[PDB]
């Protein structure tokens, strides 16, 4: 009491108003979750591809088309001229 089942089961008597929130715009409470839970749910919403059922080989295939759309990375043993290493600073063609 007042945490028992029969206390939570009883309703509030009387009629209802024909015409609360912690902050001015809604109700906000402090909560405790793991970091991984928030990161995984934010990732599921954020990543374009959150869901859409996909195994490893066709994901590697999509990676392969995305990689061949990009410019040539270059050769790291070529220090000057055409074929010089550009690397992660290679832009995507559009």
């Amino acid at each position: 009491v007042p945490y028992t089942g029969e206390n939570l089961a009883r309703p509030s008597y009387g009629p209802a108003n024909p015409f609360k929130n912690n902050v001015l715009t809604g109700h906000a409470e402090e909560m405790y979750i793991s970091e991984a839970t928030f990161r995984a749910k934010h990732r599921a919403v954020e990543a374009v591809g959150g869901g859409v059922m996909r195994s490893n080989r066709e994901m590697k295939e999509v990676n392969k088309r995305l990689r061949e759309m990009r410019e040539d990375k270059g050769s790291a043993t070529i220090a000057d001229g055409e074929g010089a290493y550009i690397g992660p600073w290679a832009r995507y063609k559009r």
């Binding site: 793991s34 970091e35 991984a36 839970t37 990161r39 995984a40 059922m53």
Partner: protein
């Protein structure tokens, strides 16, 4: 099968030793000296707006 893969990935992400604080932690590394050289040369006499 896909539920098993998702559960294994989620539990490895959550409880792995590599993510003790939620993220992968690395050591504070040394920058190339030319980065500081360029910063100090660029800001100069602090006369540009």
């Amino acid at each position: 099968a896909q539920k098993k893969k998702e559960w294994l990935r989620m539990q490895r992400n959550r409880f792995g030793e590599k993510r003790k604080g939620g993220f992968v932690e690395t050591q504070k590394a040394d920058m190339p000296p030319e980065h500081l050289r360029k910063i100090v040369k660029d800001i100069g006499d602090v006369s540009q707006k």
